[PDB]
Amino acid sequence: DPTLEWFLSHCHIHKYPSKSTLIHQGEKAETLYYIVKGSVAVLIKDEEGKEMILSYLNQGDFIGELGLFEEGQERSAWVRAKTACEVAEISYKKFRQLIQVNPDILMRLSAQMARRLQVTSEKVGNLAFLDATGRIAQTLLNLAKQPDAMTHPDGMQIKITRQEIGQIVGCSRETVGRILKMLEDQNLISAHGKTIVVYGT
Amino acid sequence: LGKPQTDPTLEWFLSHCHIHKYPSKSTLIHQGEKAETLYYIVKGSVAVLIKDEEGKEMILSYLNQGDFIGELGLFEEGQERSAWVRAKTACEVAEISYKKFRQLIQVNPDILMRLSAQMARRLQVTSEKVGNLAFLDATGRIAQTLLNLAKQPDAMTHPDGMQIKITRQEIGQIVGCSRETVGRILKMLEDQNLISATIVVYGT
Numbered sequence: 001d002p003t004l005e006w007f008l009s010h011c012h013i014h015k016y017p018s019k020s021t022l023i024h025q026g027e028k029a030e031t032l033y034y035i036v037k038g039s040v041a042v043l044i045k046d047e048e049g050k051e052m053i054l055s056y057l058n059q060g061d062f063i064g065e066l067g068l069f070e071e072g073q074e075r076s077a078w079v080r081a082k083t084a085c086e087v088a089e090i091s092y093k094k095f096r097q098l099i100q101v102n103p104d105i106l107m108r109l110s111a112q113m114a115r116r117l118q119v120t121s122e123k124v125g126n127l128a129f130l131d132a133t134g135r136i137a138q139t140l141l142n143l144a145k146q147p148d149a150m151t152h153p154d155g156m157q158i159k160i161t162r163q164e165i166g167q168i169v170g171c172s173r174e175t176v177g178r179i180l181k182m183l184e185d186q187n188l189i190s191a192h193g194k195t196i197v198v199y200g201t
Numbered sequence: 202l203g204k205p206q207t208d209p210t211l212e213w214f215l216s217h218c219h220i221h222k223y224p225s226k227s228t229l230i231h232q233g234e235k236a237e238t239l240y241y242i243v244k245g246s247v248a249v250l251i252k253d254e255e256g257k258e259m260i261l262s263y264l265n266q267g268d269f270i271g272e273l274g275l276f277e278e279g280q281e282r283s284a285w286v287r288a289k290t291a292c293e294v295a296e297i298s299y300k301k302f303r304q305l306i307q308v309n310p311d312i313l314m315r316l317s318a319q320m321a322r323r324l325q326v327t328s329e330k331v332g333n334l335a336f337l338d339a340t341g342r343i344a345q346t347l348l349n350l351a352k353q354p355d356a357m358t359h360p361d362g363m364q365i366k367i368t369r370q371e372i373g374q375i376v377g378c379s380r381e382t383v384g385r386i387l388k389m390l391e392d393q394n395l396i397s398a399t400i401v402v403y404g405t
């Protein structure tokens with residue numbers, strides 16, 4: 001679509017290998033990013049450096065937007081590539097000029113910002129209101145809706161490790177392993193390696 | 202410093218709104234209703250809440266004069282309100298349809314910049330809340346909440362530190378604790394000489 005094509009014509013596009021850190025928490029923010037290809041994880045940490053996954057973002061998602069609207073702001077989280085990525089970049093200064101030329105590009109960015117607030121608010125609800133079983137169950141549903149999930153005769157197939165699930169839902173790997181065994185016994189999933197089939201999705 | 206600078210973008214925006222007055226405790230936005238209208242707080246304070254299936258409430262945010270509300274449906278048609286918003290004081294609230302506001306954006310996108318600057322701050326705040334809920338126990342969440350509240354513009358200076366006006370029930374709704382649990386932990390923090398429980402958070 002022509003708004004995005006115009007936007008991307010004002011960016012530079014960089015390639016990043018999987019596992020590369022795109023954005024470091026607490027660095028001064030001067031640049032907006034947009035995922036042309038690939039996916040990333042948005043991470044925060046506790047004081048002893050345990051990570052939690054706030055969000056996955058995918059092709060077509062803006063990143064690094066939270067610093068755009070106020071001078072002096074710092075990055076609010078880490079962003080790490082989970083695949084090879086191609087990521088467009090543009091300075092906030094130049095983007096602010098583009099918005100005045102054609103605010104449709106701000107509409108596209110703001111649409112994502114609103115969705116992210118809705119989704120992160122739902123995550124707050126899950127953490128406040130659900131037990132570990134309820135959280136893992138909801139997480140397996142959510143992962144089954146990510147663009148990289150694969151169709152399967154019995155539902156959707158995902159590849160994710162127990163550690164990674166635990167970092168999404170706020171559980172130990174051990175707790176994840178125990179609940180996944182229970183869900184398998186209840187015939188709600190199957191698990192083979194880092195492969196999980198989420199039935200009925 | 203003193204003496205308000207005129208704000209032409211805001212005055213233009215407000216000239217296209219209708220203002221309505223809402224008493225304390227009134228519901229401004231009802232979760233699950235179709236979203237077709239944007240609001241802006243001219244005066245007053247609100248709480249943004251979500252509820253579980255048993256009606257336990259969690260407060261996501263307090264919002265105040267100069268805050269937009271009901272913005273999250275603006276960018277795609279057919280969405281529902283994502284949370285409840287309730288008046289904490291008497292409010293004066295400007296309202297405008299999403300259809301008109303979208304026209305204003307094309308006239309002067311600075312009004313969308315102001316709205317989006319608030320969405321960005323809210324995302325930072327709500328993301329920190331996700332980390333607190335995942336990483337901290339009840340005492341940790343309560344300590345962090347008191348620390349946060351004492352840094353709000355509406356905290357009052359006190360000979361012993363900063364003073365906040367908030368009930369044990371309200372803290373419970375922020376942190377995900379019963380009010381009795383909050384009361385016990387506040388007594389712990391008081392015995393540790395960190396606070397006095399309005400609540401005074403010590404500092405010099």
Ligand SMILES: Nc1ncnc2c1ncn2[C@@H]1O[C@@H]2COP(=O)(O)O[C@H]2[C@H]1O
Nearest residue numbers: 055063064065066067075076077120328
């Ligand atoms: N809750 C969230 N959901 C989705 N993305 C997020 C969230 N929190 C932070 N981010 C992204 O991570 C980025 C870190 O840098 P910024 O704060 O500039 O912009 C941030 C957002 O793009």
Ligand SMILES: Nc1ncnc2c1ncn2[C@@H]1O[C@@H]2COP(=O)(O)O[C@H]2[C@H]1O
Nearest residue numbers: 262270271272273274282283284323327
């Ligand atoms: N996490 C949050 N922080 C601050 N405000 C919120 C949050 N979630 C929802 N809201 C506000 O509550 C409103 C509910 O109606 P909308 O979803 O239209 O728009 C929403 C925002 O104005």
Ligand SMILES: Nc1ncnc2c1ncn2[C@@H]1O[C@@H]2COP(=O)(O)O[C@H]2[C@H]1O
Nearest residue numbers: 128257258259370373374377378379380
């Ligand atoms: N996990 C939770 N446990 C207990 N109360 C909670 C939780 N999450 C939210 N709350 C709300 O926090 C409130 C604190 O005051 P109450 O004890 O009157 O009622 C409580 C609920 O409405």
